[PDB]
Amino acid sequence: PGTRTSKLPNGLTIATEYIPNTSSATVGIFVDAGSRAENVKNNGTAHFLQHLAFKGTQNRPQQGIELEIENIGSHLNAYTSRENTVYYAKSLQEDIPKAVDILSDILTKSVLDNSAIERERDVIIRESEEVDKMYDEVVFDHLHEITYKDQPLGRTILGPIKNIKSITRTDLKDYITKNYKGDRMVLAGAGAVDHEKLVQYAQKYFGHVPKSESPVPLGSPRGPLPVFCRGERFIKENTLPTTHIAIALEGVSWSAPDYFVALATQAIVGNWDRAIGTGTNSPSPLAVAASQNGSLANSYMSFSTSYADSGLWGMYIVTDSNEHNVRLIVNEILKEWKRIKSGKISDAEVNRAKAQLKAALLLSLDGSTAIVEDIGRQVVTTGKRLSPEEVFEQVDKITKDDIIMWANYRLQNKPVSMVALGNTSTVPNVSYIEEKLNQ
Amino acid sequence: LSRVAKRA
Amino acid sequence: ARTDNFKLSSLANGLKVATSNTPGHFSALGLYIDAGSRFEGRNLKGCTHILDRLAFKSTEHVEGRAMAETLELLGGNYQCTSSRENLMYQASVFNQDVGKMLQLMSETVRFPKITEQELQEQKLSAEYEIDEVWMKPELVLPELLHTAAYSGETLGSPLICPRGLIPSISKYYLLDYRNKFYTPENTVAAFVGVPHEKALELTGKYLGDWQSTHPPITKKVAQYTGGESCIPPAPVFGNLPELFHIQIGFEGLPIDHPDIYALATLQTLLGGGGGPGKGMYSRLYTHVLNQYYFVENCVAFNHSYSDSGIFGISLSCIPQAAPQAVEVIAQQMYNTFANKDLRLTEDEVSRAKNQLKSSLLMNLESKLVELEDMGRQVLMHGRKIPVNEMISKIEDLKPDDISRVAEMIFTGNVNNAGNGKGRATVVMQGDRGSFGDVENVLKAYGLGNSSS
Ligand SMILES: [Zn+2]
């Protein structure tokens, strides 16, 4: 009944949530690493490492892991975000320990063969080249670069081609040594899982993990708070049929008291697609404007990214490079934020947003995997897990006024960074946006 | 609700 | 059915009410009607789709707008979809909203207004949807496969409505269809995370006084025929590689048939496709995907319905390889039972079994999936098979079993209600000549059946 928690002598946290009537589960190891724990020449390591952990360990050869997992019908996966590195598995309950075993094995005792470390550099480039075809991904990488100017958060996860061709097996081993400390990781499980037994296996297969010499509780401040830098980066590209713009303002962080209120304001502005509509029975004035007299854009989407110590909140626009005056659409978006700031929003649309928000945060925690994803991320970046029940309370209590204050604090006399890719010729700059927004 | 940029 | 906490009862009008599992963070519920394209015949062709696209619009007691905004306020996590054998309305909502959601599903199932305007919209929109669908091979090939497998009857009756038949769908035909299939005795109301006593209360309140229209029973058993069909090569778009496609299958087994679990193991064992656990150690990967690169995709399929099914292999490749397609598949099929030096191994069978178990159990981790599965099972044989039982039957599977089933299917030796033929179904996209004498290659390998 709830999320059970236990700590190991080396700091490792074991966070569990039992699910009645289940015979399978998901277990994952979450580390407070990621690319924000790299430096300029380092950039790209954590991800590289991740690819390599699947190439073989001091106990199991690459193809030995594969065949072992497939014979019991489990699944192994991993990703790297700016804030963390995650390795996790899905398997029947009988195999829970066997999975915790392999997870620790791959995460720490990995071979990192130099031969592998070389064939990989090409796979990582191919990977990189695909991301460059996903404009939204591109536009957002740049936004992070100029918004977190010369800071950890500002660098991308994949890293520069440069570093991908120059990462040395020593870089890897160092990132491991430097970052992989017990007090910096959470082992999360949900499904058919006995909390106590999982705490045991945790000791047995993760006990051997180095403790930090200067341990800090999972939630406490990294060091110097990232700082939001107003800026703009226009990327002319006359060949693109569509132009992609992103406009952001310093947002909110995971543990912030106004976290949900920010997500609530995001929901109130919402999204829109020139073809599909808003996916709401009643479109906002912005949504209506966007579509009138020919369309002012192809689509727009509100976004709100969070980190433990910072946040980005804004709009992502997509225009036809040959048909739209980007300035026209930006005005309506600014006009909509001003509307929120001025209080002219109804009880009805606030409720719709709270409802949209509630469903998005809770009804979506269905599988053991989706649930582990929540336990894991919440604890490894915050130091606790707000239960579904608690999250429901946090959203349900938000008020029209709460939103209006939040809007006035964050969208009035505050810096804005921006990025445009494509037919840059019609995009207004940052001082224009700030003038109209603050106007 | 906006996703968390991840790379696999 | 045992520690599912599965309870099943009926209202006087025939509506079966089913609940399973215990209170959780939220609940799931839905109405399941026993309808679908397999019952449209030639008269109602296209009706199942339009009706489902027409769900949750205006009703006798709720205004179109009000219906929409209230569903928005319940999280808006609901949908109505239909297939060859089902029509369902499901949704997951916060525990306290079960009743309100159920009331709404009731209104749309019992009192839809289907106004001239609502219908015009859906039809118009339906044309565009049909136009897009005919461009996605992932959709078109199976469509062609079913139509060919059953000579356009029942399970073979078009699931993608013929573009030119959409305009003639009138309110009259829609009403005719509702009067034949929307009856309490043809419906199941199912909940997950809701107390059986509460469900009975709500169900009776909103669905109790519902009465049957006592329509003419017109559900024909599916008769498998086998057959061949070929449509032209897809247009050469941009940098995308030109491919030809082919699907070969035989009559399979009904979902509640005894050897069903074995057949699913056989399917997992062949595997295929185009982190670990992704089934890269399945025969189709090994013997085809890793041995030929003129083959971009190769996977084993198992369509299983209430009274019949289709089992087989799908293969996408370079136009140049087209001529080898049939043989490559024929061989793989043959190697599952007929080749004495490639008998199914203990390892193959065991890994398969575990993967089957895994995919099922892992999917049932979803309240919505638990819901749908229970609704449909009740709708079909009126009981929900407990997980224990299921897992058991799979574990007791031994290699010879998988071998027997494999041989049975690939020899056209399946005997279902429809007393189907033993001919193979071969449907393909690309130039017809390119595939060669398909029947010859199949006969060569002793696949199929020629006598009675
Ligand atoms: Zn990668």
PDB file of C-alpha atoms in Angstrom, chain C residues 104-358:
ATOM      1  CA  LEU C 104     -22.336   8.567 -20.759  1.00  0.00           C
ATOM      2  CA  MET C 105     -21.363   5.311 -22.455  1.00  0.00           C
ATOM      3  CA  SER C 106     -24.983   4.273 -21.909  1.00  0.00           C
ATOM      4  CA  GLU C 107     -26.346   7.379 -23.594  1.00  0.00           C
ATOM      5  CA  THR C 108     -24.188   6.841 -26.671  1.00  0.00           C
ATOM      6  CA  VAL C 109     -24.942   3.130 -26.876  1.00  0.00           C
ATOM      7  CA  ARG C 110     -28.663   3.457 -26.259  1.00  0.00           C
ATOM      8  CA  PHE C 111     -29.759   6.916 -27.366  1.00  0.00           C
ATOM      9  CA  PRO C 112     -27.516   8.240 -30.094  1.00  0.00           C
ATOM     10  CA  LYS C 113     -29.122  11.047 -32.052  1.00  0.00           C
ATOM     11  CA  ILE C 114     -27.088  10.458 -35.293  1.00  0.00           C
ATOM     12  CA  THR C 115     -28.231  13.766 -36.786  1.00  0.00           C
ATOM     13  CA  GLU C 116     -27.984  14.510 -40.470  1.00  0.00           C
ATOM     14  CA  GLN C 117     -25.024  16.753 -39.781  1.00  0.00           C
ATOM     15  CA  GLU C 118     -23.138  14.351 -37.482  1.00  0.00           C
ATOM     16  CA  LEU C 119     -23.417  11.676 -40.125  1.00  0.00           C
ATOM     17  CA  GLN C 120     -22.413  13.858 -43.030  1.00  0.00           C
ATOM     18  CA  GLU C 121     -19.230  14.817 -41.174  1.00  0.00           C
ATOM     19  CA  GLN C 122     -18.250  11.258 -40.405  1.00  0.00           C
ATOM     20  CA  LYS C 123     -18.845  10.013 -43.906  1.00  0.00           C
ATOM     21  CA  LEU C 124     -16.814  12.830 -45.455  1.00  0.00           C
ATOM     22  CA  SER C 125     -14.070  12.242 -42.952  1.00  0.00           C
ATOM     23  CA  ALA C 126     -14.351   8.498 -43.617  1.00  0.00           C
ATOM     24  CA  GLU C 127     -13.426   9.000 -47.303  1.00  0.00           C
ATOM     25  CA  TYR C 128     -10.183  10.758 -46.369  1.00  0.00           C
ATOM     26  CA  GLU C 129      -9.350   8.025 -43.854  1.00  0.00           C
ATOM     27  CA  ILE C 130      -9.854   5.343 -46.533  1.00  0.00           C
ATOM     28  CA  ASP C 131      -7.627   7.230 -48.935  1.00  0.00           C
ATOM     29  CA  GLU C 132      -4.767   7.331 -46.397  1.00  0.00           C
ATOM     30  CA  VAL C 133      -5.141   3.714 -45.348  1.00  0.00           C
ATOM     31  CA  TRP C 134      -4.637   2.405 -48.865  1.00  0.00           C
ATOM     32  CA  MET C 135      -1.125   3.822 -48.806  1.00  0.00           C
ATOM     33  CA  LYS C 136       0.173   1.979 -45.745  1.00  0.00           C
ATOM     34  CA  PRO C 137       1.237  -1.608 -46.636  1.00  0.00           C
ATOM     35  CA  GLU C 138       1.202  -2.530 -42.947  1.00  0.00           C
ATOM     36  CA  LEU C 139      -2.547  -2.179 -43.275  1.00  0.00           C
ATOM     37  CA  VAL C 140      -3.328  -3.160 -46.848  1.00  0.00           C
ATOM     38  CA  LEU C 141      -1.599  -6.502 -46.955  1.00  0.00           C
ATOM     39  CA  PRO C 142      -3.419  -8.098 -44.052  1.00  0.00           C
ATOM     40  CA  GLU C 143      -6.620  -6.694 -45.457  1.00  0.00           C
ATOM     41  CA  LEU C 144      -5.912  -8.443 -48.748  1.00  0.00           C
ATOM     42  CA  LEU C 145      -4.960 -11.616 -46.820  1.00  0.00           C
ATOM     43  CA  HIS C 146      -8.317 -11.894 -45.020  1.00  0.00           C
ATOM     44  CA  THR C 147     -10.381 -11.099 -48.104  1.00  0.00           C
ATOM     45  CA  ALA C 148      -8.522 -13.792 -49.998  1.00  0.00           C
ATOM     46  CA  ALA C 149      -8.567 -16.304 -47.124  1.00  0.00           C
ATOM     47  CA  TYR C 150     -12.363 -16.259 -46.902  1.00  0.00           C
ATOM     48  CA  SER C 151     -13.417 -15.248 -50.416  1.00  0.00           C
ATOM     49  CA  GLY C 152     -14.799 -11.967 -49.162  1.00  0.00           C
ATOM     50  CA  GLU C 153     -17.151 -13.593 -46.647  1.00  0.00           C
ATOM     51  CA  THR C 154     -17.382 -13.090 -42.816  1.00  0.00           C
ATOM     52  CA  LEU C 155     -13.794 -12.752 -41.550  1.00  0.00           C
ATOM     53  CA  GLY C 156     -13.020 -11.884 -45.192  1.00  0.00           C
ATOM     54  CA  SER C 157     -15.737  -9.233 -45.505  1.00  0.00           C
ATOM     55  CA  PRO C 158     -13.870  -5.923 -46.116  1.00  0.00           C
ATOM     56  CA  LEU C 159     -12.572  -4.300 -42.927  1.00  0.00           C
ATOM     57  CA  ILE C 160     -11.616  -1.195 -44.937  1.00  0.00           C
ATOM     58  CA  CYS C 161     -14.830   0.007 -46.411  1.00  0.00           C
ATOM     59  CA  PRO C 162     -14.911   0.303 -50.215  1.00  0.00           C
ATOM     60  CA  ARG C 163     -14.541   4.051 -50.842  1.00  0.00           C
ATOM     61  CA  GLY C 164     -17.559   4.174 -53.148  1.00  0.00           C
ATOM     62  CA  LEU C 165     -19.954   2.557 -50.669  1.00  0.00           C
ATOM     63  CA  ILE C 166     -19.554   5.180 -47.969  1.00  0.00           C
ATOM     64  CA  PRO C 167     -21.901   7.734 -49.505  1.00  0.00           C
ATOM     65  CA  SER C 168     -24.819   5.279 -49.573  1.00  0.00           C
ATOM     66  CA  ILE C 169     -24.588   4.615 -45.801  1.00  0.00           C
ATOM     67  CA  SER C 170     -27.833   6.167 -44.560  1.00  0.00           C
ATOM     68  CA  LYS C 171     -29.244   6.710 -41.150  1.00  0.00           C
ATOM     69  CA  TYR C 172     -31.647   3.907 -42.078  1.00  0.00           C
ATOM     70  CA  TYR C 173     -28.889   1.341 -42.466  1.00  0.00           C
ATOM     71  CA  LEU C 174     -27.178   2.513 -39.293  1.00  0.00           C
ATOM     72  CA  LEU C 175     -30.441   2.133 -37.428  1.00  0.00           C
ATOM     73  CA  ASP C 176     -30.937  -1.290 -39.051  1.00  0.00           C
ATOM     74  CA  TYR C 177     -27.577  -2.341 -37.749  1.00  0.00           C
ATOM     75  CA  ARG C 178     -28.145  -1.011 -34.262  1.00  0.00           C
ATOM     76  CA  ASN C 179     -31.450  -2.872 -34.134  1.00  0.00           C
ATOM     77  CA  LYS C 180     -29.721  -6.125 -34.957  1.00  0.00           C
ATOM     78  CA  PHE C 181     -26.695  -5.847 -32.668  1.00  0.00           C
ATOM     79  CA  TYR C 182     -27.151  -3.255 -29.963  1.00  0.00           C
ATOM     80  CA  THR C 183     -29.201  -5.415 -27.607  1.00  0.00           C
ATOM     81  CA  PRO C 184     -28.524  -6.167 -23.946  1.00  0.00           C
ATOM     82  CA  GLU C 185     -28.147  -9.856 -24.624  1.00  0.00           C
ATOM     83  CA  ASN C 186     -25.382  -9.033 -27.155  1.00  0.00           C
ATOM     84  CA  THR C 187     -23.534  -6.775 -24.703  1.00  0.00           C
ATOM     85  CA  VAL C 188     -21.126  -7.009 -21.790  1.00  0.00           C
ATOM     86  CA  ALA C 189     -20.410  -4.276 -19.284  1.00  0.00           C
ATOM     87  CA  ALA C 190     -17.048  -4.811 -17.650  1.00  0.00           C
ATOM     88  CA  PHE C 191     -15.135  -3.014 -14.936  1.00  0.00           C
ATOM     89  CA  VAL C 192     -11.691  -3.252 -13.352  1.00  0.00           C
ATOM     90  CA  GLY C 193     -11.055  -1.935  -9.891  1.00  0.00           C
ATOM     91  CA  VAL C 194     -14.733  -1.629  -9.209  1.00  0.00           C
ATOM     92  CA  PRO C 195     -16.675  -3.724  -6.632  1.00  0.00           C
ATOM     93  CA  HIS C 196     -19.094  -6.132  -8.231  1.00  0.00           C
ATOM     94  CA  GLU C 197     -21.892  -4.829  -6.027  1.00  0.00           C
ATOM     95  CA  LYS C 198     -21.258  -1.260  -7.184  1.00  0.00           C
ATOM     96  CA  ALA C 199     -21.114  -2.313 -10.841  1.00  0.00           C
ATOM     97  CA  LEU C 200     -24.430  -4.089 -10.583  1.00  0.00           C
ATOM     98  CA  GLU C 201     -25.925  -0.977  -9.095  1.00  0.00           C
ATOM     99  CA  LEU C 202     -24.715   1.354 -11.797  1.00  0.00           C
ATOM    100  CA  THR C 203     -25.307  -1.077 -14.646  1.00  0.00           C
ATOM    101  CA  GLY C 204     -28.917  -1.637 -13.644  1.00  0.00           C
ATOM    102  CA  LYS C 205     -29.453   2.070 -13.190  1.00  0.00           C
ATOM    103  CA  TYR C 206     -28.292   2.988 -16.691  1.00  0.00           C
ATOM    104  CA  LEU C 207     -28.669  -0.275 -18.666  1.00  0.00           C
ATOM    105  CA  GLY C 208     -31.376  -2.090 -16.673  1.00  0.00           C
ATOM    106  CA  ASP C 209     -34.528  -1.032 -18.463  1.00  0.00           C
ATOM    107  CA  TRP C 210     -32.879  -1.609 -21.808  1.00  0.00           C
ATOM    108  CA  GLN C 211     -34.969  -4.122 -23.863  1.00  0.00           C
ATOM    109  CA  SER C 212     -34.104  -6.294 -26.847  1.00  0.00           C
ATOM    110  CA  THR C 213     -35.552  -5.620 -30.273  1.00  0.00           C
ATOM    111  CA  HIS C 214     -35.602  -9.414 -30.959  1.00  0.00           C
ATOM    112  CA  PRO C 215     -33.957  -9.269 -34.380  1.00  0.00           C
ATOM    113  CA  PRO C 216     -33.273 -12.156 -36.828  1.00  0.00           C
ATOM    114  CA  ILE C 217     -30.145 -14.132 -35.832  1.00  0.00           C
ATOM    115  CA  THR C 218     -27.784 -13.704 -38.762  1.00  0.00           C
ATOM    116  CA  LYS C 219     -24.316 -14.740 -37.624  1.00  0.00           C
ATOM    117  CA  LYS C 220     -22.737 -16.998 -40.242  1.00  0.00           C
ATOM    118  CA  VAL C 221     -19.834 -19.288 -39.338  1.00  0.00           C
ATOM    119  CA  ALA C 222     -16.631 -18.404 -41.140  1.00  0.00           C
ATOM    120  CA  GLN C 223     -15.700 -20.745 -44.006  1.00  0.00           C
ATOM    121  CA  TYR C 224     -12.002 -20.678 -44.899  1.00  0.00           C
ATOM    122  CA  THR C 225     -11.343 -21.022 -48.630  1.00  0.00           C
ATOM    123  CA  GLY C 226      -7.754 -20.005 -49.307  1.00  0.00           C
ATOM    124  CA  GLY C 227      -6.841 -18.132 -52.481  1.00  0.00           C
ATOM    125  CA  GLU C 228      -4.492 -15.742 -54.333  1.00  0.00           C
ATOM    126  CA  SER C 229      -4.480 -12.016 -54.919  1.00  0.00           C
ATOM    127  CA  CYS C 230      -1.948  -9.457 -56.150  1.00  0.00           C
ATOM    128  CA  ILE C 231      -2.074  -5.679 -56.282  1.00  0.00           C
ATOM    129  CA  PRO C 232       0.330  -3.354 -58.190  1.00  0.00           C
ATOM    130  CA  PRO C 233       3.784  -2.177 -56.916  1.00  0.00           C
ATOM    131  CA  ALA C 234       3.562   0.814 -54.642  1.00  0.00           C
ATOM    132  CA  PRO C 235       4.663   4.195 -56.048  1.00  0.00           C
ATOM    133  CA  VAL C 236       8.424   4.959 -55.814  1.00  0.00           C
ATOM    134  CA  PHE C 237       8.456   7.909 -53.380  1.00  0.00           C
ATOM    135  CA  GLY C 238      11.674   9.653 -52.357  1.00  0.00           C
ATOM    136  CA  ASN C 239      14.895   7.980 -51.231  1.00  0.00           C
ATOM    137  CA  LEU C 240      12.821   5.105 -49.786  1.00  0.00           C
ATOM    138  CA  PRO C 241      13.797   1.643 -51.162  1.00  0.00           C
ATOM    139  CA  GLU C 242      11.289  -0.008 -53.456  1.00  0.00           C
ATOM    140  CA  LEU C 243       9.900  -3.176 -51.889  1.00  0.00           C
ATOM    141  CA  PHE C 244       7.612  -6.028 -52.849  1.00  0.00           C
ATOM    142  CA  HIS C 245       5.502  -7.781 -50.242  1.00  0.00           C
ATOM    143  CA  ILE C 246       4.061 -11.211 -49.784  1.00  0.00           C
ATOM    144  CA  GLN C 247       2.040 -13.017 -47.140  1.00  0.00           C
ATOM    145  CA  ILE C 248       1.479 -16.765 -47.071  1.00  0.00           C
ATOM    146  CA  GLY C 249      -0.755 -18.493 -44.564  1.00  0.00           C
ATOM    147  CA  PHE C 250      -3.082 -21.362 -43.854  1.00  0.00           C
ATOM    148  CA  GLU C 251      -6.271 -21.716 -41.769  1.00  0.00           C
ATOM    149  CA  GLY C 252      -5.294 -21.398 -38.099  1.00  0.00           C
ATOM    150  CA  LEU C 253      -7.124 -22.015 -34.875  1.00  0.00           C
ATOM    151  CA  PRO C 254     -10.012 -20.336 -32.994  1.00  0.00           C
ATOM    152  CA  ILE C 255      -8.827 -18.428 -29.927  1.00  0.00           C
ATOM    153  CA  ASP C 256     -10.344 -20.853 -27.458  1.00  0.00           C
ATOM    154  CA  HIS C 257      -9.198 -23.945 -29.351  1.00  0.00           C
ATOM    155  CA  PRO C 258      -7.137 -26.386 -27.189  1.00  0.00           C
ATOM    156  CA  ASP C 259      -3.900 -26.226 -29.207  1.00  0.00           C
ATOM    157  CA  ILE C 260      -4.033 -22.407 -29.302  1.00  0.00           C
ATOM    158  CA  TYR C 261      -1.273 -22.063 -26.735  1.00  0.00           C
ATOM    159  CA  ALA C 262       0.980 -24.379 -28.752  1.00  0.00           C
ATOM    160  CA  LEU C 263       0.285 -22.422 -31.940  1.00  0.00           C
ATOM    161  CA  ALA C 264       1.201 -19.149 -30.201  1.00  0.00           C
ATOM    162  CA  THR C 265       4.458 -20.767 -29.081  1.00  0.00           C
ATOM    163  CA  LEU C 266       5.079 -21.775 -32.702  1.00  0.00           C
ATOM    164  CA  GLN C 267       4.478 -18.155 -33.662  1.00  0.00           C
ATOM    165  CA  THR C 268       6.922 -16.880 -31.040  1.00  0.00           C
ATOM    166  CA  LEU C 269       9.429 -19.528 -32.062  1.00  0.00           C
ATOM    167  CA  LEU C 270       9.388 -18.400 -35.712  1.00  0.00           C
ATOM    168  CA  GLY C 271       9.385 -14.781 -34.507  1.00  0.00           C
ATOM    169  CA  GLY C 272      10.955 -12.461 -37.035  1.00  0.00           C
ATOM    170  CA  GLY C 273      10.802  -8.707 -37.447  1.00  0.00           C
ATOM    171  CA  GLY C 274      12.696  -6.221 -39.628  1.00  0.00           C
ATOM    172  CA  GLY C 275      17.692  -4.011 -26.362  1.00  0.00           C
ATOM    173  CA  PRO C 276      17.860  -7.769 -25.742  1.00  0.00           C
ATOM    174  CA  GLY C 277      14.617  -9.639 -25.188  1.00  0.00           C
ATOM    175  CA  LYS C 278      13.531  -8.262 -28.544  1.00  0.00           C
ATOM    176  CA  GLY C 279      13.526 -11.868 -29.889  1.00  0.00           C
ATOM    177  CA  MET C 280      16.581 -11.751 -32.153  1.00  0.00           C
ATOM    178  CA  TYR C 281      17.175 -15.524 -31.501  1.00  0.00           C
ATOM    179  CA  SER C 282      14.006 -16.645 -33.293  1.00  0.00           C
ATOM    180  CA  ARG C 283      14.188 -18.820 -36.341  1.00  0.00           C
ATOM    181  CA  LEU C 284      13.039 -16.187 -38.774  1.00  0.00           C
ATOM    182  CA  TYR C 285      15.828 -13.845 -37.548  1.00  0.00           C
ATOM    183  CA  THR C 286      18.453 -16.545 -37.694  1.00  0.00           C
ATOM    184  CA  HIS C 287      17.485 -18.400 -40.869  1.00  0.00           C
ATOM    185  CA  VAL C 288      16.208 -15.427 -42.873  1.00  0.00           C
ATOM    186  CA  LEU C 289      16.854 -11.949 -41.578  1.00  0.00           C
ATOM    187  CA  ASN C 290      20.526 -12.689 -40.936  1.00  0.00           C
ATOM    188  CA  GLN C 291      21.067 -14.736 -44.095  1.00  0.00           C
ATOM    189  CA  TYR C 292      19.516 -12.467 -46.688  1.00  0.00           C
ATOM    190  CA  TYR C 293      19.590  -8.718 -46.845  1.00  0.00           C
ATOM    191  CA  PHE C 294      17.502  -8.451 -49.909  1.00  0.00           C
ATOM    192  CA  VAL C 295      14.872  -9.214 -47.248  1.00  0.00           C
ATOM    193  CA  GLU C 296      14.052  -6.125 -45.188  1.00  0.00           C
ATOM    194  CA  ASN C 297      11.309  -7.672 -43.094  1.00  0.00           C
ATOM    195  CA  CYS C 298      10.112 -11.156 -42.254  1.00  0.00           C
ATOM    196  CA  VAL C 299       7.716 -12.060 -39.520  1.00  0.00           C
ATOM    197  CA  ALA C 300       5.269 -14.742 -38.464  1.00  0.00           C
ATOM    198  CA  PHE C 301       1.639 -13.891 -37.942  1.00  0.00           C
ATOM    199  CA  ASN C 302      -1.279 -15.545 -36.200  1.00  0.00           C
ATOM    200  CA  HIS C 303      -4.731 -14.093 -36.732  1.00  0.00           C
ATOM    201  CA  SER C 304      -7.106 -15.912 -34.436  1.00  0.00           C
ATOM    202  CA  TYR C 305     -10.847 -15.399 -34.184  1.00  0.00           C
ATOM    203  CA  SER C 306     -13.872 -17.044 -32.587  1.00  0.00           C
ATOM    204  CA  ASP C 307     -14.366 -19.810 -35.209  1.00  0.00           C
ATOM    205  CA  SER C 308     -11.305 -19.753 -37.469  1.00  0.00           C
ATOM    206  CA  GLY C 309      -7.952 -18.036 -38.072  1.00  0.00           C
ATOM    207  CA  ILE C 310      -5.032 -17.532 -40.434  1.00  0.00           C
ATOM    208  CA  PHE C 311      -1.441 -18.600 -39.612  1.00  0.00           C
ATOM    209  CA  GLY C 312       1.572 -17.722 -41.634  1.00  0.00           C
ATOM    210  CA  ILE C 313       4.637 -15.747 -42.578  1.00  0.00           C
ATOM    211  CA  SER C 314       4.951 -12.241 -43.997  1.00  0.00           C
ATOM    212  CA  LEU C 315       7.987 -11.230 -46.072  1.00  0.00           C
ATOM    213  CA  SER C 316       9.068  -7.857 -47.496  1.00  0.00           C
ATOM    214  CA  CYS C 317      11.993  -7.671 -49.896  1.00  0.00           C
ATOM    215  CA  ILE C 318      13.863  -6.021 -52.801  1.00  0.00           C
ATOM    216  CA  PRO C 319      12.051  -6.352 -56.161  1.00  0.00           C
ATOM    217  CA  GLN C 320      15.031  -8.343 -57.380  1.00  0.00           C
ATOM    218  CA  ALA C 321      14.512 -11.058 -54.763  1.00  0.00           C
ATOM    219  CA  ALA C 322      10.796 -11.475 -55.455  1.00  0.00           C
ATOM    220  CA  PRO C 323      11.497 -14.750 -57.261  1.00  0.00           C
ATOM    221  CA  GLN C 324      12.982 -16.328 -54.144  1.00  0.00           C
ATOM    222  CA  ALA C 325      10.289 -15.111 -51.752  1.00  0.00           C
ATOM    223  CA  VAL C 326       7.935 -18.064 -51.938  1.00  0.00           C
ATOM    224  CA  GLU C 327      10.665 -20.646 -51.555  1.00  0.00           C
ATOM    225  CA  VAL C 328      12.322 -18.933 -48.607  1.00  0.00           C
ATOM    226  CA  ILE C 329       9.032 -18.992 -46.735  1.00  0.00           C
ATOM    227  CA  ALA C 330       8.061 -22.487 -47.833  1.00  0.00           C
ATOM    228  CA  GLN C 331      11.379 -23.735 -46.488  1.00  0.00           C
ATOM    229  CA  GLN C 332      10.983 -22.100 -43.076  1.00  0.00           C
ATOM    230  CA  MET C 333       7.506 -23.607 -42.768  1.00  0.00           C
ATOM    231  CA  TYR C 334       8.847 -27.027 -43.803  1.00  0.00           C
ATOM    232  CA  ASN C 335      11.708 -26.766 -41.259  1.00  0.00           C
ATOM    233  CA  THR C 336       9.283 -26.641 -38.328  1.00  0.00           C
ATOM    234  CA  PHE C 337       8.226 -30.278 -38.692  1.00  0.00           C
ATOM    235  CA  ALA C 338       9.125 -31.951 -42.020  1.00  0.00           C
ATOM    236  CA  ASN C 339      12.915 -31.610 -41.866  1.00  0.00           C
ATOM    237  CA  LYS C 340      14.419 -34.312 -39.669  1.00  0.00           C
ATOM    238  CA  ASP C 341      17.710 -32.433 -39.201  1.00  0.00           C
ATOM    239  CA  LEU C 342      16.069 -29.229 -37.957  1.00  0.00           C
ATOM    240  CA  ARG C 343      13.466 -30.675 -35.589  1.00  0.00           C
ATOM    241  CA  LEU C 344      12.365 -28.080 -33.033  1.00  0.00           C
ATOM    242  CA  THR C 345      14.881 -28.068 -30.192  1.00  0.00           C
ATOM    243  CA  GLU C 346      14.344 -28.102 -26.436  1.00  0.00           C
ATOM    244  CA  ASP C 347      16.018 -24.696 -26.224  1.00  0.00           C
ATOM    245  CA  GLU C 348      14.007 -23.119 -28.986  1.00  0.00           C
ATOM    246  CA  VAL C 349      10.726 -24.346 -27.525  1.00  0.00           C
ATOM    247  CA  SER C 350      11.617 -23.349 -23.984  1.00  0.00           C
ATOM    248  CA  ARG C 351      12.704 -19.815 -24.857  1.00  0.00           C
ATOM    249  CA  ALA C 352       9.578 -19.426 -26.960  1.00  0.00           C
ATOM    250  CA  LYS C 353       7.352 -20.550 -24.100  1.00  0.00           C
ATOM    251  CA  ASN C 354       8.954 -18.093 -21.752  1.00  0.00           C
ATOM    252  CA  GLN C 355       8.613 -15.249 -24.247  1.00  0.00           C
ATOM    253  CA  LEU C 356       4.997 -16.053 -24.854  1.00  0.00           C
ATOM    254  CA  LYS C 357       4.295 -16.090 -21.130  1.00  0.00           C
ATOM    255  CA  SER C 358       6.223 -12.896 -20.742  1.00  0.00           C
TER     256      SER C 358
END
